[PDB]
């Protein structure tokens, strides 16, 4: 048993909705320090790490650390019914379902049966990112979108004072450039000229759920994975780790 | 002949659009006291009563009480072309069509042939409602919508200080609760604990055309019909009478 | 080579998008006085004339007058990615593609291969328009739309103090009337009572890309073509010449 409460059900729906983009099924670790979740897409190309500490919850009462299995699509169809000014209550009895409550103009309660989830325990090799990039969400989603007009894959090129996302076609070619003079670029650190490429289908599902002025941080290296971070209520962290196109 | 005028064509389109949800064909009684319409859905599960008195019309000139037949879909495709600041003019000559005019930035006139409509004359048995409920439209449409995630039918349960719309599934279950402490509940009177169930497909079409902050009144009894009211310009009344699931 | 710049990429996308409605392929004449384009729909029923003078461009640098061929759909899929506050740069090297750049939160560059376009040189017979009409875009698009409920074709009837767009059916009939008392009518000059008819499918594609409060001027004559003008930044001119239904 636990009772966990989040003010603004529509925001929380958005996290879940984002993770649901690549995840079908996930195991949620619920501790007193917080809630965490680690899953992979079906193709095992994307890793997802979600970390929701106590501090972003209005009431966090975990008596008996616990892991629960959740079908991510049925969870997101339910959360999508919560409205922006609703209070969300995730609560668990001695049974095997998640109580999901929206409290706003009314008390609306759903019961979502908890499932049995394959808890693969695997993690990380070398993480020698030689590049760090912070940009506005709308650049990144624009970039994924423009490149999709042209190609399968998008190449990330980080140099000097330049970050470049480039895609090329059989006649067309697109290229998005960000220098520190640009409004869309919040930060750029480059230990070494770095080139790498990623599947646009994957990138696209990663950034669907990303907001207007959201700040996203990318870390990557030459022909190695792409790490994409963005923060939730300043203390939540959603991380994607994307395999490169080789 | 008659000339009837309504300021705000888009509002009137909305009534008609709502009634059109369950009605294909209808007969409109046009008198000097007002306009009224009584029809049933094809399955004869829902009764619709619409009452539009003189007082909600800017000009109401009925010389020769008259009943006219209208195809409800062709009427609603036409009314859907009227814009919010348009003045609506429903006018009839000695011919067999309805003149529908929108007057705004321009005079736009449609002619809708009047049809021959089966005027079944039937009405009401016992109406021993042991429960009355007034709630915000957005609760009701949220409620119909959440339950549709789970089930065929939605059970209405009115007790003490509680109103409850509940649906259950084969694994999932949803429940919407309203007490007078709640913002969404405007009024609750319960002569006796009352339980009854309704088809969600029917409920859904009943509340599609219902507005944000609209106030809806429900009256029902145990295993008997559901009456749903809401008002139009404070003096119009649209009523649904819904057969229970038995 | 040339460099041409337009502040507000989304506006320019809208011109192009409008012309693209009837045009698949077009040749763009680029001179020092401005940019112009003349094309016809596949059915050779509509003529399109587009004129974009230097004065509507923030930077206009044409060294070597030049004509370029453009696939209109690939150009409009690209321009549709420019956002409202973007600066648009159309630039050309000694190669055979158009550089399309959006400069805003970032530098986004597309390369659109220039094509080979059938440059038919044909133009105009008698232009004895006996009627001139200026109206709000929302009337015209409403009018095309209401008539589509009823018929293949829309008849334009200009008299005294009256302009009338009328369509009739096999039971239904629609009629839109504009007199100088009306808000939607900005101007009306009638040398002679004028009647003519046009295909609604064509009209509809002509006015899709037309704005809320846009002012459109129609000139036509009895059973002769319809000329439709509207202006861009007060000095751009997009013209349609539509064959009548005979």
CATH fold descriptor of chain A: Proliferating Cell Nuclear Antigen
Structural class of chain A: alpha+beta
What is the oligomer described by this structure?
homotrimer
Order of helices and strands of chain A: EHEEEEEHEEEEHEEEEEHEEE
The helix fraction of chain A, in percent, is 10-25%
Gross morphology of chain A is: elongated
Radius of gyration from the alpha-carbon trace of chain A, in angstroms: 19 Å
Largest interface: A-B, 15 and 20 residues
Q: Architecture of chain A, CATH level 2?
A: Box
The CATH class designation of chain A is Alpha Beta
Number of strands of chain A: 18
Largest sheet of chain A: 9 strands, antiparallel
Q: What's the number of helices of chain A?
A: 4
Short description:
Chain A is of the alpha+beta class and 246 residues long.
Would you spell out the secondary-structure blueprint of this structure?
3 copies of one chain form a homotrimer.
Chain A: E1 2-7, H1 9-20, E2 25-30, E3 34-40, E4 46-53, E5 59-62, E6 66-71, H2 72-79, E7 87-92, E8 97-103, E9 107-113, E10 131-136, H3 137-147, E11 153-158, E12 162-168, E13 173-179, E14 185-190, E15 194-199, H4 200-207, E16 215-220, E17 226-232, E18 236-242
Antiparallel strand pairs in A: 1-5, 1-7, 2-3, 2-6, 3-4, 4-18, 7-8, 8-9, 10-14, 10-16, 11-12, 11-15, 12-13, 16-17, 17-18
């Amino acid at each position: 048993p636990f009772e966990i409460v989040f003010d603004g059900a529509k925001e929380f729906a958005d996290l879940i909705a984002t993770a649901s983009n690549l995840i079908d099924e996930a195991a949620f670790k619920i501790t007193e320090e917080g809630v965490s979740m680690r899953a992979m897409d079906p193709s095992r190309v994307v890793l997802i790490d979600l970390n929701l500490p106590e501090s972003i919850f209005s009431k966090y009462e975990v008596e008996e650390p616990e892991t629960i299995g959740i079908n991510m699509d049925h969870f997101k169809k339910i959360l999508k019914r919560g409205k922006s000014k609703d209070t969300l209550i995730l609560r668990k009895g001695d049974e095997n379902f998640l109580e999901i409550t929206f409290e706003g103009t009314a008390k609306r309660t759903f019961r979502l049966p908890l499932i049995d989830v394959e808890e693969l325990e695997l993690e990380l090799p070398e993480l020698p990112f030689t590049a760090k990039v912070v940009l506005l969400g709308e650049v990144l989603k624009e970039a994924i979108k423009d490149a999709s007009l042209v190609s399968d894959s998008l190449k990330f090129i980080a140099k000097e004072d330049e970050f470049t996302m480039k895609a090329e076609g059989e006649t067309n070619e697109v290229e998005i450039k960000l220098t520190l003079e640009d409004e869309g670029l919040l930060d750029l650190e480059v230990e070494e000229e770095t080139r790498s490429a990623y599947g646009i289908s994957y990138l696209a599902d990663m950034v669907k759920g990303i907001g207007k002025a959201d700040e996203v941080t990318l870390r990557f290296g030459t022909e190695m994975p792409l790490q994409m971070d963005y923060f939730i209520r300043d203390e939540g962290k959603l991380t994607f780790l994307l395999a490169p196109r080789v």
